[PDB]
Design an enzyme around this catalytic site. Structure first.
Site, short mmCIF file in Angstrom:
data_model
loop_
_atom_site.label_atom_id
_atom_site.label_comp_id
_atom_site.label_asym_id
_atom_site.label_seq_id
_atom_site.Cartn_x
_atom_site.Cartn_y
_atom_site.Cartn_z
CD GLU A 60 -2.85 -0.92 -0.20
OE1 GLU A 60 -3.24 0.22 -0.54
OE2 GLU A 60 -3.08 -1.95 -0.87
CG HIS A 86 -11.84 -9.00 -12.07
ND1 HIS A 86 -10.94 -9.85 -11.47
CD2 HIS A 86 -11.53 -7.75 -11.64
CE1 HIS A 86 -10.12 -9.14 -10.70
NE2 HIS A 86 -10.46 -7.87 -10.79
ZN LIG Z 1 -2.06 -2.26 -3.72
#
Ligand SMILES: [Zn+2]
Ligand SMILES: *[C@@H]1O[C@H](CO)[C@@H](O)[C@H](O)[C@H]1NC(C)=O
Ligand SMILES: *[C@@H]1O[C@H](CO)[C@@H](O)[C@H](O)[C@H]1NC(C)=O
Ligand SMILES: *[C@@H]1O[C@H](CO)[C@@H](O)[C@H](O)[C@H]1NC(C)=O
Ligand SMILES: *[C@@H]1O[C@H](CO)[C@@H](O)[C@H](O)[C@H]1NC(C)=O
Ligand SMILES: [Cl-]
Lengths: 597, 48
Positions: A357, A487
């Site tokens: 992140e 998806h």
């Molecule tokens: Zn990520």
């Protein structure tokens, strides 16, 4: 007088207004996601249609500029990205039909429920149970029941909706001068007007086919090994030469083979790298994990994060009074504001996820000086790849030993490294054929090469041909089993994962070469190398104002995707696997099926 | 459409970056010209 300067002025005003509007919208999203209420949802709707109305108004204002009369490449790309009108060029009735279909089918995916045949009032949703039912339980019958019930509950409903969706997408593509919706999605990788760096729409298909052809030996060797292990596990369900069942692959659709590591571990007595004990022993918390990630990122020369990120971003679960959805996501609110939101636990997996992140954050802050239209990666496939390469670098035992999470007396040997390579292959090698297969099937249904009445038949035939998976229960054309995936069922492209898998390992090879490291690539580390940091920044800064091929050459020196880094990475696993596979059949037979006896 | 209001706003909030932080600036200007000087710094002495 000229038109390019008028477009420049329009873009100048657009950037200034859109910065404030997008900041408002993203701040509203951050406050809704952190604190789940109803007025937060209302503020989200208000900001959402405000931003969408601004987008549509600006497109309808700037559509009148012809792209043929602009010479500056940056404003050309700005006006090309803005001028895409999306669903607006279609008739309003069909646009509302399309959005209604999207909403209905998204709700079907999100709220789809299956009930056991013994208790009508006991039903399980896909998220918080069906996955576990087949990702933790080893019983064949329960996995079969879950798979069959889920598909029979979702595909039958979603078949005609998906047919209408595909038809509408074909009309949408022909409206804006594309042959098919697959061409519209492939349009992400297109660049024109740059000599020595151009790329065509069929070039992507050709390149992915060539790369898959080069990679398929590794997949087939791993398939043979996993089939042998499952033979040792389940002796009366699969032919030693046939394809693996769909519901014996670990997750909802066989996307990842991470689950089967426990059943297919080569050496189950060797210890596994887990610093959770070191996590709890040293009283580490979320702030120390993110400081560790900060120092890891500053070691290569990247700047430390801003004070607002350490002041206002929520680095832990906000108790029980307020609920929040904390999937790992990096937010670029704009105006120099950066945020992270994830429920942090004291685990090694959370350590790697936090590294990923903050790698996302670093990538996003890299192009902060670029205009509003250009603050994104060279294509879609660089963000998550750059996020994952950082986790790959941090997962090396050498870094953990250096930062004092593993005792220096730990003895690295061939067995532990083989196990590490095998789990990495099960996570990575398994998903490549499935992503390629799904995206190729989507291309080939969008282009119209396949009539409606054999979609599922061709889908399963080509699957048993290439991906080596055969259905345990025969299915008719009443099913829409592709829409059983997040998806497919919510309008996202899927070749992104294959492109990311290529990009991340190509980047790892390039940076390891720049890092002057000797030995296997899985041990390679990039810390304490400011040359690696400056090389990374040299591609981090551009964004997407330049062709993605140029950005790729800026880091690796190559203008196209190549498969050498992956095979070089997995060569020790290659030779180990081929040594194992000397006494087992290599390949799969398409004719055999579990239901045929 | 091509004619705009030439004033913008300085959106200020206490959760902003240092580079975007609202710094306070005052500039001091002198003049070294031959003219009767009215302002300059003090000085003091010792004891008698
Ligand atoms: Zn990520
Ligand atoms: C979430 O919103 C409620 C409603 O105003 C508020 O009382 C609560 O303090 C908020 N939670 C925070 C700020 O963590
Ligand atoms: C394109 O426009 C930008 C923005 O004004 C300018 O800085 C740049 O020099 C221009 N490039 C060319 C080739 O005119
Ligand atoms: C940020 O990085 C600089 C350069 O390495 C360092 O001098 C400074 O102490 C760091 N600040 C924090 C809060 O870690
Ligand atoms: C990086 O350099 C620092 C400073 O000398 C040192 O303490 C640390 O052990 C080094 N780490 C690696 C992995 O070389
Ligand atoms: Cl599936």
């Amino acid at each position: 007088s000229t038109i390019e300067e008028q477009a420049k002025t329009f873009l100048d005003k657009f950037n200034h207004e859109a910065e404030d509007l997008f900041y408002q919208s993203s701040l509203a999203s951050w406050n809704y996601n952190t604190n789940i209420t109803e007025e937060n949802v209302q503020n989200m709707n208000n900001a959402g249609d405000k931003w969408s109305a601004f987008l549509k108004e600006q497109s309808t204002l700037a559509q009148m500029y012809p792209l043929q009369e602009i010479q500056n490449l940056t404003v050309k790309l700005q006006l090309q990205a803005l001028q895409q009108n999306g669903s607006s060029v279609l008739s309003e009735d069909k646009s509302k039909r399309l959005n209604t279909i999207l909403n209905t089918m998204s709700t079907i995916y999100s709220t789809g429920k299956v009930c056991n045949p013994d208790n009508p009032q006991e039903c399980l949703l896909l998220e918080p149970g069906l996955n576990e039912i087949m990702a933790n339980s080893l019983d064949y019958n329960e996995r079969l029941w879950a798979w069959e019930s889920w598909r029979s509950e979702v595909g039958k409903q979603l078949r005609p909706l998906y047919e209408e969706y595909v038809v509408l997408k074909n009309e949408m593509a022909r409206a804006n001068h594309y042959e098919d919706y697959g061409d519209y999605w492939r349009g992400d990788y297109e660049v024109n007007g740059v000599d020595g760096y151009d790329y065509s729409r069929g070039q992507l298909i050709e390149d992915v086919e060539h790369t898959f052809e080069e990679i398929k030996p590794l997949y087939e060797h791993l398939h043979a090994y996993v089939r042998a292990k499952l033979m040792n596990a389940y002796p009366s369900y699969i032919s030693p030469i046939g394809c693996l069942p769909a519901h014996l692959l670990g997750d909802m659709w066989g996307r990842f083979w991470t689950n089967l590591y426990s059943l297919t571990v080569p050496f189950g007595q060797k210890p596994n790298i887990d610093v959770t004990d070191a996590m709890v022993d040293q009283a580490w918390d979320a702030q120390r994990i993110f400081k560790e990630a900060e120092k890891f990122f500053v070691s290569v020369g990247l700047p430390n994060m801003t004070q607002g990120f350490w002041e206002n971003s929520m680095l832990t679960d906000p108790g029980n009074v307020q609920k929040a959805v904390c999937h790992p996501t990096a937010w670029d609110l704009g105006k120099g504001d950066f945020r992270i939101l994830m429920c942090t636990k004291v685990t090694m997996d959370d350590f790697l996820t936090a590294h990923h992140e903050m790698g996302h954050i670093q990538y996003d802050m890299a192009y902060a000086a670029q205009p509003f239209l250009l603050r994104n990666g060279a294509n879609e496939g660089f963000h998550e790849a750059v996020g994952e390469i950082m986790s790959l670098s941090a997962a090396t035992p050498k870094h953990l030993k250096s930062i004092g999470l593993l005792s220096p007396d730990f003895q690295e040997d061939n067995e532990t490294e083989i196990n590490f390579l095998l789990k990495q292959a099960l996570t990575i090698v398994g998903t490549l054929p499935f992503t390629y297969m799904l995206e190729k099937w989507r291309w080939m249904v969008f282009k119209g090469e396949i009539p409606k009445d054999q979609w599922m038949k061709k889908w399963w035939e080509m699957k048993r041909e290439i991906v080596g998976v055969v259905e345990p229960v025969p299915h008719d054309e009443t099913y829409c089993d592709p829409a059983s995936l997040f998806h497919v069922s919510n309008d996202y492209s899927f070749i992104r994962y294959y492109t990311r898998t290529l990009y991340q390992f190509q980047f790892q090879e390039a940076l390891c070469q720049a890092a002057k490291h000797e030995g296997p690539l899985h041990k390679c580390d990039i810390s304490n190398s400011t040359e690696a940091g400056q090389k990374l920044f040299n591609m981090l800064r551009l964004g997407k104002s330049e062709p993605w091929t140029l950005a790729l050459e800026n880091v690796v020196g190559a203008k196209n995707m190549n498969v050498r880094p992956l095979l070089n990475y997995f060569e020790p696993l290659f030779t180990w696997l081929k040594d194992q596979n000397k006494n087992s059949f290599v390949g799969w037979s398409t004719d055999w099926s579990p239901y045929a006896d | 459409p091509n004619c705009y209001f030439p004033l913008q706003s300085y959106g200020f909030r206490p959760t902003y970056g240092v580079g975007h932080q609202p710094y306070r600036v005052v500039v001091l200007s002198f003049e070294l010209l031959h003219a009767p000087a009215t302002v300059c710094g003090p000085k003091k002495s010792t004891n008698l």
